[PDB]
Amino acid sequence: VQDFFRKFIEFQNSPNEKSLQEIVKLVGQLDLRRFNWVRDVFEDIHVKERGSKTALIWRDINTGEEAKLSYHELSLMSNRVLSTLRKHGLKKGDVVYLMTKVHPMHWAVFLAVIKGGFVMVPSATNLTVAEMKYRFSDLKPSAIISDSLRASVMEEALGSLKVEKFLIDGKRETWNSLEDESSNAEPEDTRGEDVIINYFTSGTTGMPKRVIHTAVSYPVGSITTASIVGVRESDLHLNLSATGWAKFAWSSFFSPLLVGATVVGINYEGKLDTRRYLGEVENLGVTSFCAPPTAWRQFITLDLDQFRFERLRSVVSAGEPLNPEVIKIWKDKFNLTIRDFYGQTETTAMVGNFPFLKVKPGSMGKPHPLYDIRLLDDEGKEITKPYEVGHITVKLNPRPIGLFLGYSDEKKNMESFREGYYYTGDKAYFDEEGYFYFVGRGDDVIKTSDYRVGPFEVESALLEHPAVAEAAVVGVPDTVRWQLVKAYIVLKKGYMPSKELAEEIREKMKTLLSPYKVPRIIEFVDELPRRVELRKREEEKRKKGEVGQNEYVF
Amino acid sequence: VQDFFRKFIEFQNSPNEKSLQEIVKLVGQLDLRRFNWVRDVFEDIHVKERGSKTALIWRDINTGEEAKLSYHELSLMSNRVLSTLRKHGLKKGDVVYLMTKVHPMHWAVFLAVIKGGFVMVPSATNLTVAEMKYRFSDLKPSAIISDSLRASVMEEALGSLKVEKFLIDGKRETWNSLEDESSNAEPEDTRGEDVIINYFTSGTTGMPKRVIHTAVSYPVGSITTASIVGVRESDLHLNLSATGWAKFAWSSFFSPLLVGATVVGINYEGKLDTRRYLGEVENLGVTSFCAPPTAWRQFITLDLDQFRFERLRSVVSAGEPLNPEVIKIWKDKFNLTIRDFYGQTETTAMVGNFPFLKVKPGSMGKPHPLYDIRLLDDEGKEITKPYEVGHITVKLNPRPIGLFLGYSDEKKNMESFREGYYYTGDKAYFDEEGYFYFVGRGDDVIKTSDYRVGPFEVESALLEHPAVAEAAVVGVPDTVRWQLVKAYIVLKKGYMPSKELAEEIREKMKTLLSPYKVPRIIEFVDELPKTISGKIRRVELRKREEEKRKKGEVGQNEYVF
Amino acid sequence: YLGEVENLGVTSFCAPPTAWRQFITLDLDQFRFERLRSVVSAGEPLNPEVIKIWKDKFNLTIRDFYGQTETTAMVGNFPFLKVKPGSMGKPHPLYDIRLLDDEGKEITKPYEVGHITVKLNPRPIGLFLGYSDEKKNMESFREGYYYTGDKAYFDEEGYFYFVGRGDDVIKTSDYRVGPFEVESALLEHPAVAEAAVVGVPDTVRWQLVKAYIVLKKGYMPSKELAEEIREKMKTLLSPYKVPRIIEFVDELPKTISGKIRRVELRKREEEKRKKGEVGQNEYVF
Ligand SMILES: CC(=O)OP(=O)(O)OC[C@H]1O[C@@H](n2cnc3c(N)ncnc32)[C@H](O)[C@@H]1O
Ligand SMILES: Nc1ncnc2c1ncn2[C@@H]1O[C@H](COP(=O)(O)O)[C@@H](O)[C@H]1O
Ligand SMILES: Nc1ncnc2c1ncn2[C@@H]1O[C@H](COP(=O)(O)O)[C@@H](O)[C@H]1O
Known part of the structure; x- marks a missing residue:
């Protein structure tokens, strides 16, 4: 049933409780044995039905550079990538480190990797030679891909390990271009459970371990996210986030491209200029905006009578709690509720204030019905009392779709998955209306x-x-x-x-x-x-x- | 006037800001009306005081050949050149093309020319028949001098112009030897402003034109170079450069022989063998080494634990910017800073990280006080604000000494020499400490x-x-x-x-x-x-x-x- | 040479891609080619860009086709066959042409590279008897197939694309x-x-x-x-x-064997x- 996505896309244009439940049930009936989100969704739905809709509006607020790409041009551009990678002898399952700024060619590479069935390792641009060497010790690269701004850092962390290297902007000796090949490579027939992403995440005990995501966990999990976020096809959707993390995939990539929206991407080097970035949001007429509470906390200190936000309709936060006072200031001014929602690199969005859900300030909302979320106490018995704190857990039979495979670390799997639950290692309480409130980490x-x-x-x-x-x-x-x-x-x-x-x-x-x-x-x-x-x-x-x-x- | 160079040579052994300024002032008081650097410096200081010190150590990394000349033997050898030229009827001002590999006889010819008041045209060994014919159309040769490896190219480019031809190495029909006349002919009493060198250089507009240098501009301007480079009498100094250019007259000839040092020269055909050249640097215990960033970029890729360089104390770069990362790798390993410096065929060194100057990476340093260096904007007004880019210019009243006479092209003089400034056609900004940073060409x-x-x-x-x-x-x-x-x-x-x-x-x-x-x-x-006018x-x-x-x-x- | 082609009113012209590559660099407005109706290439691949230049000018497709000394033409763009550029076309039905993989099993999938082979029962007519060298026959004639020692893939319409030699x-x-x-x-x-x-x-x-x-x-x-x-x-x-x-x-x-x-x-x-x-x-x- 690819008719699922066509039903999903409509659900988005006007959602409600009841129609949500249908969406839920329909996911359970997907055939995900052999799946490839690029072929099956990007190409087969979006490129086919809206090939000449704007897929991406991009701007670098420092350089000034701007780009506009349709679903077509983007699909082509991604194929040139995949052709070039394959030409350098990249088989399915091969490791590809990706360290670039916000840039069209980032999306391009994402696509090429998912389509080609590679294991991509998103690496942020601020990672040090040391941190990158750590990564290489833990998982060896077959190929690495950078912008010219961070090529020396990769070059030095490599030393002289054999890899194919690639630049997204400019030339450099022994680095290759990505668009010198053909505008068509064929899909890799991926199993749904095949690995496409590894995320190095920090934990309490050791050095960072890899979180393992599949060709369905993110590409299909993101539904839950997209549904909470309330992103539509009509929307121009901007997610303020950086390149080497889950939240980019979550909202700068999958959630928008699932529903055939226009992605809006803004790159900046250095520290966030909250009054220029906010002005670029308005100036580009974003309509759906995800930003982290850190950003939101900075925005509310502005003189907010500088802005109209005539076009802006949906506003969302994730990653940390969202102070009730932030929510309130932004509402009182622009008449929009900043809807907080919850998840981890290990998952997709699991709990959230949906568009049609009455927001209680400083609550992450209620569980998405596709995750069986339970507060458990110290014995692992289920909490059935308001204002009692406990562990946020995910019930594993049946296994929710957006959940990672596990860690690359067998000890960490033994701690997290147990008595038939995955422990998030987060704590929360619910209230008299079943709204969840984040308490903190049970970790350090x-x-x-x-x-x-x-x-x-x-x-x-x-x-x-x-x-x-x-x-x-x-x-x-x-x-x-x-x-x-x-x-x-x-x-x-x-x-x-x-x-x-x-x-x-x-x-x-x-x-x-x-x-x-x-x-x-x-x-x-x-x-x-x-x-x-x-x-x-x-x-x-x-x-x-x-x-x-x-x-x-x- | 001889005392100048003796003060200079000392300045070198321990230089600083203040003592530099003294040197500057002393040059301004030189009487250079009638001057001849060979007679007055080479012969009168070095041949006289250190006649049997090694002037040159030469080595061909292909053939293996090594050959050594003292200040004396070189002075003699050069006189045989000048006698041989004179014998073939060469008066002062006559044109001499010089196209040879790195070889002692090259230095010899340099000397013979400067002493005899001839006009030498350095020609590179990778120049084509076509390039050379262009040169001959622009300036007709009285004599040409080659090695046997490039004699055919000169012979073909010549066609049937009357000239005296000469080989530095080997036999060839209707080519002459340079060492067959007596090692005893007299100085030409040159005016200091008399022409001795012409350099064909590219511009942004046309075919390459001649840069005109005098018996003082290079022979005495090179002070600025020598001073930045930090070459001493004690030193064995090597310059990685080719024969037909100005970097050679700069660090392969003038800068070392000014201070009575030992020149080190290495010849190679074809591709630079980075590992063999660096091996020869160490193996010959060079102490001062100037190579271009191109070379430096290639060196740092080697496994550098092969080398000690226990005898190397000075390392320098010029001709393009010097990546901060190159400087760093070489420092971390051998505990030396590669000191960048700036100039052009038209000049000597104009800006540079001197020995005593704290190096800021990616900066060519500060202006040499013997050039009046100014950043001008597009309208020609002087820039006095940090981090503002402009044209590097040389103030012409009074006219700095190492500056060429002009081009042989009157149009190109009109563009470069304007409102009492010579424009280098290079763009830069300076910082809060007066350090210059290269931006690029304002030319094409x-x-x-x-x-x-x-x-x-x-x-x-x-x-x-x-x-x-x-x-x-x-x-x-x-x-x-x-x-x-x-x-x-x-x-x-x-x-x-x-x-x-x-x-x-x-x-x-x-x-x-x-x-x-x-x-x-x-x-x-x-x-x-195209523009409205049709200009590209x-x-x-x-x-x-x-x-x-x-x-x-x-x-x-x-x-x- | 092309002046002499026109001057003699040749109507069918075979030339090798080497020649073709040189021809297209001329100023081609010197020629009309009043009489020329067929143009063909053999022996190496024929660059798509060469094919196109000659077409745009004289309105003729240079048809590439494939074979060895050991054979006659085995695969080819026939006159009635729509040319896909950089493809040597389809097998001649008088040869039994098969792509085999490394294990020697017949390839049944588009865009999969393998060895061009000739199936030997029955033995096609234009195929040489063998080599005068029995060692070389043992390499070329194996498990019921003569191996050309060329590699290729086919597409969804059965057009062949040359990849290169399995040899040196x-x-x-x-x-x-x-x-x-x-x-x-x-x-x-x-x-x-x-x-x-x-x-x-x-x-x-x-x-x-x-x-x-x-x-x-x-x-x-x-x-x-x-x-x-x-x-x-x-x-x-x-x-x-x-x-x-x-x-x-x-x-x-070198390998462990000593082989280059x-x-x-x-x-x-x-x-x-x-x-x-x-x-x-x-x-x-
Ligand atoms: C060295 C020489 O004689 O060069 P030459 O062939 O005459 O060309 C002169 C041009 O070289 C460039 N240049 C020289 N030194 C440089 C330096 N330290 N940093 C950056 N650029 C540098 C400028 O662009 C000059 O205008
Ligand atoms: N809305 C939120 N409120 C509070 N904590 C959050 C929220 N979203 C994410 N987190 C925390 O961030 C962690 C996931 O971090 P990351 O793996 O970087 O997405 C979770 O385990 C939570 O502790
Ligand atoms: N059209 C063609 N495209 C690519 N390679 C070819 C073509 N025709 C011939 N060759 C190569 O040339 C060989 C024929 O060699 P020969 O026996 O000299 O004709 C074949 O085995 C191929 O590998």
């Missing part, structure tokens, strides 16, 4: 600025500084970024705790760690205690507005 | 692989193919060679765009043009973007290439070789 | 060339210790004969040496066989082409 995992961060990874990099004897990294409350990365450091004898030392250590960490990971606070202490108790101690200090004796804030 | 001049290339010259050669109606040659970014030569060609009615045609045209170009000039890319187009917008051909690069596409009739 | 055989300028023959002649030169002869991509002649040479101790890799070797080879070898390039190397990349990886010689050539660089002692004539 951190989320600064909509980036998941592993403590041991930062502790590790910290011991690389000669001064550092011991280290413990925790997250500390911050209204702007949800949490800050703080490091407790025990110093070697010889170092005296100074501002200039804290800085020197931080600057070192910047060469080893992605910026979001580099501690914003460094506190030197005589000894370490129980990352739990580091947090508890911070809390009692907050209530007396007192700094630590050698706590240095950046 | 091209720089492949540290060779300056003229568009019209390649466009001309392209019209020689019956199929070609018009042509527009621009450079395209390339990390290995700075720029690639691309040609846009409009075809005559009757011929159709094919790869096979593109090739046929390129192979033709190979017989007419030096290899560096032969387009690496050929694109057929229906028309070339080479600018917009470049812009178009850029937009195509940023969506990783090659063109619909672009053929890459 | 070379075709410069529509002349089939044996490596060992040239390697042998090269060891005749005192200086030559080892030799590997490969074909390198060339638009004009399809492939160039290039020689990799390892030198005996004593001789130094020079242009003058390369030439001296080449001029010797001119007295021994038919011109088409005389290497157009000679590259001296320290060693030839002409594979990796080609891959290396490719990476060097993309930087328009010659090898350290590669001499092009």
Whole structure:
């Protein structure tokens, strides 16, 4: 039944409770034994029925460069990619690292990979030589693809491992172009359970592990997302997110292209300019906008009488909680509710405020009916009481569609999947109306600025500084970024705790760690205690507005 | 006046800002009305004080040959040249083409020319019969001097012009030896402003024209070079450069022999063997080494744990920008900074990271105080604000010493010498500390692989193919060679765009043009973007290439070789 | 030659792609070709762009078609058959043409590459008796099939596309060339210790004969040496066989067997082409 998508697309143009349930039931009747979302959905529905609709409107707010691509031109451009890859001897299942800015050719490559049945490893543009070498140790690349802005970082992290390398913008010695081949390569007949994506995600214990997604988990899971988001074919849909993560796939790629919408993509280097980006949203007449609460928190501090947003109809958030006061300010002004919704790299959207659902501020809504979401207590017994906190879990019989295969780590599978549930390692409570409220991680995992961060990874990099004897990294409350990365450091004898030392250590960490990971606070202490108790101690200090004796804030 | 160079040579052994300024002032007080650098510096300082020190160590990495000359033997050998020339009736001012490989007899001839007040025309060994015929049309030779490897090319380009011909290595019918007359002929009492060198260089407008250098401009301007380079009397100094250009007179000849150092010269035919050349650098214990970024880029790709370079203390680059990453790799390994410096055939070194100057990567350093260097905007007003790009210019009242006399082309003088400034046609910005950063050409001049290339010259050669109606040659970014030569060609009615045609045209170009000039890319187009007047917008051909690069596409009739 | 074609009013013209490639570079408004109705090519692939130029001008399709010394024409664009460019057309029904895979099973799928073979029961008529060499017959005639040693794929309409040789055989300028023959002649030169002869991509002649040479101790890799070797080879070898390039190397990349990886010689050539660089002692004539 590909008639599913045609029914789905209509559901979107005016959804409701009842018609949702039909969509749900119809997914259960899909044949997903052999599936390939590009062939079966992109080409067979969208390129065929609306080949000359605008698939992408792109702009770089720094350079000025702009591009407009129809579903046709994009399909062609993607085939040139896939032809070029195949020409360099890329078989199905081969590993392809992808590290580029927001750019048409990114979508292009996405398509080429999904169509060609490759394993793509999205890599963000801010990843360091060190972090990239880690990745290569864990999974070896058959091919890598970059922009010219980050070619040297790939080149250096590689050293001299044999790979086929490719540039999306410009030439460089021993890098290849992507459009020198044919505008038609044939689909790879993928099984639905075949692997197409690996995502390195941070966890509490170790260095980052791979999350494994299939030719259906994201390409068909995204339904749940698209349905919560309320993205339509008519829409111009902008998702403010970066290139090497799930949320790009989630909303910059799959959710819009599922429903045949116009994707809007905006690239910027460096720090977000909230008043120019928001102006470009209006200037491009986006109608559906996904942005992370970090962005939203910055937007509401603007003078909001600069903007009309005549065209803007749907507004959405994901990745962190959405302060009730943010929701309210944006509503009072533009008469739109910012609908928060929930998921992980491991999943698609699992819980969410749908378009037709009454929003309760600072609630992520209620479960999407395609996921069997349960709050369990410490014994793993199901919670049936308001205002009782517990573990967010996903029931595995029957196995929801958008759920990853598992981790590349067998220990981590043993912890997460058990007694017939996948544990998200998130905590929540529900209320008297069954609305879910995020409480936090049961882990020590951190989320600064909509980036998941592993403590041991930062502790590790910290011991690389000669001064550092011991280290413990925790997250500390911050209204702007949800949490800050703080490091407790025990110093070697010889170092005296100074501002200039804290800085020197931080600057070192910047060469080893992605910026979001580099501690914003460094506190030197005589000894370490129980990352739990580091947090508890911070809390009692907050209530007396007192700094630590050698706590240095950046 | 001799005392100048003795003060200079000391400055070198330990230089700084302040003592540089003293040097500057002292040059301004030299009496250079009648001057001859061979007599007055080579002979009177070096041959006299260090006659039996090694002036030159030479080595051919192909043949294996090594040969060593002292300041004396070289002075003698050069006099035999000058005696031999004079014997064949060469008066002052007479034109002498010099086309040879790296070889002692090259230095010899340099000397003989400077001493005898002749006009030498350095000619490169990869110049074609066609290129050479062009040269002869523009400046008729009184004598020509070659190695045996390139005698045929001169013989053919000559046709049946009367000239005296000479071989530096081996026998050939109707070619003469240079060492057969007595090693005793006298200086020509040259005016300091008398012409001794002509360099054919490419411009953005036409066929290549002669840059005119005097008995002081290079022989004494090279101070600026020597000073940035940081070459001493103690040093064994090697310059990776070719015979027919100005970088040779710069670091292979003048800069070392000024300070009484030992010159190191290495000859190779064909492709540079990076591992063998670097091995020969180490093996000969060179101490000062100047190579171009092209070379440097290639060196850093080696496994560099093969080398110690225990004897190397100075490393320098010039001719194109020097990637910060090159500088870094070489430093981390051998604990030396590759010091970038800037200039052109028309000048000596004008801007440079001197020995004592903290290097900011991707900056060519600060201006040498013997040139009055100014960034001007398009309207010709002086820029005094950081991070604003403009034209690099040289203020002409008073006229700096290392600056050429002008071009042999009056149109090109009209464009370069304007309102009391000479325009280099290079663009740059300076920072808050007065460090200069290269932006690129404001011309359409091209720089492949540290060779300056003229568009019209390649466009001309392209019209020689019956199929070609018009042509527009621009450079395209390339990390290995700075720029690639691309040609846009409009075809005559009757011929159709094919790869096979593109090739046929390129192979033709190979017989007419030096290899560096032969387009690496050929694109057929229906028309070339023009202004209202009908003038080609080479600018917009470049812009178009850029937009195509940023969506990783090659063109619909672009053929890459 | 094309002036003489027109002047004699030829009506059917076979020429090889080498010739065709050269013709299309002319100014073709010099000719009418009043009398010419059929144009055909054989022996190497026929570039789609060549086909098109000649068509746009004279309104004729150059029909490529396929075969070997061992056979007659086995596959071809017949006059009544719609040409798909860069396809040698469909099999002649008087040959039983089969694509077989590596295991020797018959290919039943579009866009799958394999060996062009001739099925031997019954034995087609234009097929040679065999070679005068019984070893070479044992290689070419196997498990009921004569192998052409060419590789191809077919499409959904049964049109064949040439992929290349399974062999190390070379075709410069529509002349089939044996490596060992040239390697042998090269060891005749005192200086030559080892030799590997490969074909390198060339638009004009399809492939160039290039020689990799390892030198005996004593001789130094020079242009003058390369030439001296080449001029010797001119007295021994038919011109088409005389290497157009000679590259001296320290060693030839080899398998565990000692067999030359002409594979990796080609891959290396490719990476060097993309930087328009010659090898350290590669001499092009
Ligand atoms: C070296 C020489 O004599 O060159 P020459 O052939 O006369 O050409 C002169 C042109 O070289 C370029 N150039 C020279 N030095 C440079 C440097 N340090 N950084 C960047 N560009 C540099 C400029 O563009 C000049 O105008
Ligand atoms: N709407 C949300 N509210 C609160 N936490 C969220 C929300 N969305 C995502 N998260 C957190 O982010 C994690 C997933 O991060 P990532 O793998 O980067 O998408 C989840 O495990 C949650 O803890
Ligand atoms: N039309 C063609 N396209 C590609 N290769 C061809 C073609 N015709 C001949 N060849 C090659 O040339 C060989 C024939 O060699 P010969 O016996 O000299 O004609 C075949 O085995 C092919 O590999």
